[PDB]
DNA sequence: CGAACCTGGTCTTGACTCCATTGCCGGATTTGTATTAGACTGGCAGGGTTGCCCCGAAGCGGGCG
């Protein structure tokens, strides 16, 4: 079905596999963080420039 | 009988030639680095074949605390 932790346990146990091919390992690694939009990019760029000026001032 | 001679070299002096050998210098080519603002967001991809043997690891029946 879609619940009762059978499919959930299957997805969890299939997440903790070997994946001996290094390309598949790196792709499963990078398919983790959430993608962003233009507002998130604006926010992160402003935070980056603020942090850079703050550490240069320090 | 002596005497010129003539010619092996042995060697030097002086002028001449000629080509390496750096040295700038001006320009040519060669090589390296930086920068491009619309938006773009998790692979293609190729095969699976023997026989025999040894041995080491995974997993399952079976009793035990």
CA distance A17 to A20: 9
Q: What experimental approach yielded this model?
A: cryo-EM
Please give the C-alpha separations between residue A14 and each of A11, A31, A48, in angstroms, as whole numbers. 5, 15, 37
- Resolution in Å, one decimal, please: 3.4
Task: Write out residues whose CB is closer than 7 A to strand B.
Answer: A 21, 23-24, 27-28, 30-31, 35-36
B strand bases under 7 Å from protein CB? 41-43
Q: Say how far A14 CA is from B63 C1', in Å.
A: 33
* DSSP annotation of A4: T
Nearest-nucleotide field for A30 (CA, C1'): B42
* DSSP annotation of A46: H
> CA angle, corner A23, sides to A18 and A29, nearest 5?
65
Rg (CA), chain A: 19
CA distance A18 to A20: 6
The total of other beta-carbon atoms located within 10 Å of residue A25's CB is 13
Q: Residue holding tokens 């146990």?
A: A13
């Amino acid at each position: 079905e879609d619940e009762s932790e059978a499919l959930r346990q299957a997805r969890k146990d299939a997440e903790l596999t070997a994946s001996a091919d290094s390309v598949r390992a790196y792709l499963k690694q990078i398919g983790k963080v959430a993608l962003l939009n233009a507002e998130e990019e604006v926010e992160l760029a402003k935070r980056i420039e603020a942090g850079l000026y703050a550490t240069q001032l320090m």
